[model samples]
Target: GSSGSSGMAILFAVVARGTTILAKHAWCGGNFLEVTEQILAKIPSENNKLTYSHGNYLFHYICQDRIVYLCITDDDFERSRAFNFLNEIKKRFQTTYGSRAQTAPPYAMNSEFSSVLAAQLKHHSSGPSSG
Candidate 1:
């Protein structure tokens, strides 16, 4: 299914959402509520987790320092959807990146980055998404 918002997001927010989205008081046509600042602030600075909910939508994220992946979706997308996506991201990143990530030398910034994304679309590298 789809909504008019851009890409795959139902409502867009910064990683630090709550205040940011609410201050604009917008996202999903300004029609949602109770996703207040307190809730967003309460989210722990942890890795690969599901930690947000607001009525019909839920927010889930996985962060491994510089690598963070997230998804917010209505209930139709099973609760584990976001967690799984982020988990996959972290697993791939760990296989390559160590703690001391540094700058790239070329304009392309290591061509492998885009290669990974493009290749993964048709198949799963770490195995399928399990519910």
Candidate 2:
């Protein structure tokens, strides 16, 4: 049932600016525009929203109040599992960059922070999942 390779591919993740993305992953790590235009666009639906699929990728996210933690993967990645991963990243972001997470560029890509998150997310993504 696994979608394989790109199926589980978490191509994007970000900590956005109050439903709008500010800092983000870059290069092969691109999750910015996806967060603001696509993800935020659906928030007011007033439901327990989780993921959104567009093209070949699935957009998963968690809202820590205004701060948004998002993960984008393919149809293969388990939905429940992806949200769990997003929550973990939110924890990491808070630990690494406290209150500044709101206005600071903590999630900016290519920094030591980006890789730290990538390594963690990547590890869990490839490993086992109850889903």
Candidate 3:
């Protein structure tokens, strides 16, 4: 879903409020998950990885080889403008990440699990001849 997006927003908000954004890129899945989980564990705490005040936002930039996330805290007026900036980012993502040149993994997919299960059951009950 939007978990990564929300995380980025939270981190942005924190940074905008004068909190430091500390991020370490992990090449391996285990390292990435471990570091992300550890940082998430301390959210909303005084000494957490990121913190935010009233007006703040987070942003995330995900690419084929890396993920870049940041936080921005601004005044109410500037915060409102951030949405426009985010929209620009969305357009850029569609262009850069959505094109064939990028060739990243598809974000959405459709499959019929029930049909597969039914086929499996039929094969089991009817033997190989069910094919």
Give the top-scoring candidate (TM-score).
Answer: 2
Q: Stretches of candidate 1 above 4 Å error?
A: 1-48, 54-56, 65-67, 99-111, 118-131
lDDT of each: 0.42, 0.61, 0.29
Off by over 4 Å in 2: 1-7, 19-22, 26-38, 41-48, 103-110, 127-131
| Candidate 1: worst-modelled 10 consecutive residues by lDDT | 17-26
TM-score of 2: 0.66
Alpha-carbon TM-score of each model against the true structure: 0.41, 0.66, 0.26
lDDT tens per residue, model 1, 25-85: 1233453334444554555546545566666677665555543334445555565545554
Best by lDDT: 2
**Top-down TM-score ranking:** 2, 1, 3
lDDT of 2 by residue, 1-131 (tens): 84444335465666664555554653264435744466576665332446667666687766664666666666877787778777787787777664666556533433765667667755775533423
lDDT of 3 by residue, 88-116 (tens): 43344344443422343322210222233
Better of 1 and 3 by TM-score: 1
Model 2's alpha-carbon lDDT is 0.61
Looking at model 2, residue 27 earns an lDDT score of 28
Cα lDDT of model 1 overall? 0.42
